[PDB]
Every structure is written in C-alpha cells, then in structure tokens.
Amino acid sequence: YTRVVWCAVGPEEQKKCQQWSQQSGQNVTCATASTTDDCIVLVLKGEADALNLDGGYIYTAGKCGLVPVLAENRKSSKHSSLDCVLRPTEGYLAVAVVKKANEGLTWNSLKDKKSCHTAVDRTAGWNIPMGLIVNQTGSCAFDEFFSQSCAPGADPKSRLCALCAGDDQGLDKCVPNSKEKYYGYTGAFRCLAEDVGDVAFVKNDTVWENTNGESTADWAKNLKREDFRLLCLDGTRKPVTEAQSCHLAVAPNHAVVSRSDRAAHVEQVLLHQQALFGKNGKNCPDKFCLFKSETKNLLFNDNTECLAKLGGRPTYEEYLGTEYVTAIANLKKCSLEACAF
C-alpha cells in the first residue's frame, strides 16, 4: 500500500514508467495522460500522485495547490563534498540558439522569423522568450510575432504550430508530448538543426548534449557546436561556450510535484527509488536507469544526477523565485488568484 502513482505524459513516457513500475516491484505504479496539464488534473483528482515538471507547469500546478517535492540536480562541481541529494540546485540557462551560417540574425531581428519552442507554457521554450518579446513589442500579439513556429500545445491550425511535424505517421501534429517530433528541449533543437526554424528556445545543456558526437541519433550525429550561436539580449551572437554570459534567464530546475497531503510519502519513495535506479544506483546500468531514455528526456531530464531535497520547505512561489513568478503572471495577462482548472 506504500505505493506511488506516477503520471506519464504520452505513450513513450508510459513505456518507461511501466519498466520502472515492473523493476520497482510495483512500489511505483503508472498513470498516463496526453498532456502535462491532464497529468496535473489527475494528481489534483488524486488519481495520480506525482510527476516531474518544468517551472512553467510548476506555476500552473502551484496555483492549483500542488507543491514542489524534490528537484532535479544536474552535475555541477560547486558545493564540492556535499552529496547530490543535499546540494542546492543552481538552475539552468535559458538560451536562444541559431545557426552560425544564418549570419546577421540577432535578438533584434527575430520578428517575422521562424521559431522552435519546447512547448507553450514551458520556461526556456516559452515563458522567458515570449515574456521578453511581449515586454519589448509592447503588445500581446505574441501569436503574430514569428512568421511560423512549432510551439507544441498551441492551436494546430495556427502559425504557432505550422512547423510542427507530429509523429511517424504525421498524426498528433503540435501535441505537447514526445509524440511530436519537435517537442521539448531535444525536439526544439532538432527543429533548428534541420533548419525547419531560424531560432530555437531551449537550455544551454541541450546544445552541448546534442552536438560533437554527444548524441548518436541520426539528425544529431553530424552536428558541431561551432555551427551554432547563442543570441544575447544585447543584440550580439556568441559561441555556445559563452552561455554564462549570453542567456535569456536562469530557470528554476524541473521538480517533482504532488498534492500537499502526499508530499512526504512521495519524497520517501522517491529517495528510495533513486538509491536503486539513479546515477550510481544499485540496479542502475544492470537492470533499470531512471535518468536514461536515449536523449529523449522521458519522465526526467537525461542529465539529472539525482533528485535533491529542497531548501526551506518552499512554497511553489519560493521555489520558482519572485522574479520568474511575476514574469509568468505578467505574460499570462495576454491570453493571479487562479487555477485554470
């Protein structure tokens, strides 16, 4: 009965979750939904217990009463002897990437260009970019800013979905789950790498993890970092090595969320599950690895070293940080005391 129901988004996450379930002796079980928002609703209804979420969704879930439980922690040498599970998270760098060969494209010449986004409502792929754009154009017509985009989660017949490809069969065009070829960090970067779009809104890590042989995938095998550039807010272009000085914002790490009343049990099971299937996990390589899924970032980002305890039992607002929270609020006035469910 000490069982946690994980919510998987889309059929691919479901498959990994089932594998996890099996390997955990059903200590973790699986529920599936077609979108992250649907998964939030399952948790709210109590039909699922938890799932790991990007900051923009943490905001959505937070307004509905869901709370941060543990955060993804990427590999970072700082805070040196403290173990990963207890090290404070640093956040990731939201960037705008373009092809080096697309010379003369800068932050100041993005209007009417083609764009690639992880999904609507996500931090680096949407909230940070569109927030900055709305800020600068003075207008809410962010839907009319780029000429075409792939923004999974938007209206499939609109220009924001025009560049989306859907699945093998061309179904599910623009669905905000991994069935959409250009969904998420890797999909948005593949969207740029295949020259479907002019700019991709992703994170620093994505560029590195999908270039210079870091990915064996076919569209990525032959990609080289020098062939790419980051767009800085001051109108300059820089090599992908300069992300610490050329990003759009620092984003709060994706984190596990759950209903307040299940938070403690979820944390307990989670800590014990990673001990088994985490980075240096007991059954990890050997049986199952929670933080691997061939660059597809299923359930968790593939670069996660561990899920770390939070600092100061933070509310969702503290977790996200005041800067980011007001930026999201300021952006959502275009489409506070809420929960759109």
Ligand SMILES: *[C@@H]1O[C@H](CO)[C@@H](O[C@@H]2O[C@H](CO)[C@@H](O[C@H]3O[C@H](CO)[C@@H](O[C@H]4O[C@H](CO)[C@@H](O)[C@H](O)[C@@H]4O)[C@H](O)[C@@H]3O)[C@H](O)[C@H]2NC(C)=O)[C@H](O)[C@H]1NC(C)=O
């Ligand atoms: C941008 O994101 C990047 C990826 O998330 C960050 O770069 C990564 O930086 C870390 C240290 O902060 C580095 O950790 C260590 O990884 C290896 C040891 O486990 C080690 O070297 C490698 O050997 C091979 C190279 O021929 C290669 O196959 C293997 O993947 C390793 O890279 C390395 O020396 C280091 O001690 C990661 O390796 C590195 N990631 C990659 C894939 O390059 C970067 O810091 C981020 N920048 C910002 C601004 O945040």
Ligand SMILES: *[C@H]1O[C@H](CO)[C@@H](O[C@@H]2O[C@H](CO)[C@@H](O[C@H]3O[C@H](CO)[C@@H](O)[C@H](O)[C@@H]3O)[C@H](O)[C@H]2NC(C)=O)[C@H](O)[C@H]1NC(C)=O
């Ligand atoms: C674009 O939209 C908004 C206006 O450009 C902006 O919201 C404003 O953000 C600033 C900075 O985060 C907040 O600033 C602070 O101002 C002073 C300190 O300089 C203090 O007195 C305040 O306590 C506060 O910390 C503003 O609160 C906020 N303005 C309001 C009230 O809406 C968004 O941040 C911009 N969007 C993006 C994505 O950057």
Ligand SMILES: CC(=O)N[C@@H]1[C@@H](O)[C@H](O[C@@H]2O[C@H](CO)[C@@H](O)[C@H](O)[C@H]2NC(C)=O)[C@@H](CO)O[C@H]1O
């Ligand atoms: C616990 C602590 O001292 N952290 C504060 C945070 O509440 C708060 O949010 C953090 O903002 C940073 C960049 O502005 C991000 O690096 C970080 O991801 C984010 N915190 C977390 C844990 O997600 C910031 C801003 O008010 O101040 C920190 O001092």
Ligand SMILES: *[C@@H]1O[C@H](CO)[C@@H](O[C@@H]2O[C@H](CO)[C@@H](O)[C@H](O)[C@H]2NC(C)=O)[C@H](O)[C@H]1NC(C)=O
């Ligand atoms: C399912 O979770 C339960 C409870 O968290 C685990 O049961 C015990 O776990 C503790 C710590 O690992 C051990 O001291 C006990 O030996 C476990 N009980 C027994 C008799 O197995 C259990 O390990 C988990 N099950 C699986 C298959 O992973």
Ligand SMILES: [Fe+3]
């Ligand atoms: Fe994110």
Ligand SMILES: [Zn+2]
């Ligand atoms: Zn910065």
Ligand SMILES: [Zn+2]
């Ligand atoms: Zn607090």
